Ligand binder design. Sequence first.
Ligand SMILES: Nc1nc(-c2ccc3c(N)[nH]nc3c2)cc(N2CCOCC2)n1
Length: 277
Amino acid sequence: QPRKKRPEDFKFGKILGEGSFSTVVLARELATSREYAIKILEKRHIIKENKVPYVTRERDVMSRLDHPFFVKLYFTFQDDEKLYFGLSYAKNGELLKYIRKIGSFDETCTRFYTAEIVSALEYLHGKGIIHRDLKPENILLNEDMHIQITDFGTAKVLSSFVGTAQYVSPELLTEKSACKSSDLWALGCIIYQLVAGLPPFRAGNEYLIFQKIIKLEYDFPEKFFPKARDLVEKLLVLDATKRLGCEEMEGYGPLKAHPFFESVTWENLHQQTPPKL
Ligand SMILES: Nc1nc(-c2ccc3c(N)[nH]nc3c2)cc(N2CCOCC2)n1
């Protein structure tokens, strides 16, 4: 392995993302002219807030992932005050940006991008890993317009915390208990959001959102691809064990075989040319 890199190895530029405990900065490594998304974390703040386990889990998970639909951790280093994670740079940014830009996706784009997310999840879940906070902000777009899912500090590694309110599954609001089905619920929301342009559970505040979730209080616009709607209904199911794609439903076989994916070739998605938005 190469020498431990250092801040002076890079020319830093614009800010790509911001979280409570981190900032993502675009940086060009000088010796290679490669662009990386460097995630910068202030040690003191992490310790002060008891986030060390989250930072640790992210590093450990993003190292174990080796798949085109996931942002990669290439390296790490630190100075006196800060940790640096060198991440894949997804030039086109958040999927959320595109949902806003174009309003909502047509069937073909919905189909392609949903299949990529399913395929990513299948890989993630195959490694006994749960994202727990899947959302359009987390689903980045590469320069070639394929997805790269990021942000893994809140993931769980199958042998406490609540993600973004709108994508939170009912079981989290009723037991503090998560599983692969939690990601599948989020998948249901995200699909709904690609088609309708908005997330299925909206309200004035988090409490009300949570109220709708446990009540399964949402509904479909009249202009909602029927097969997409049928799939969404098989995902947004209160009982976590009855969600298409989960182990009690026999996994990703039946999920990938859903009529909505009729025209999908699952094996080489990443090699296919994404439909234009
Ligand atoms: N892992 C992780 N990645 C990113 C991130 C953001 C933009 C990126 C890009 N354009 N290429 N790569 C990127 C990675 C942010 C993040 N934060 C931000 C929000 O707070 C939660 C954690 N965490």
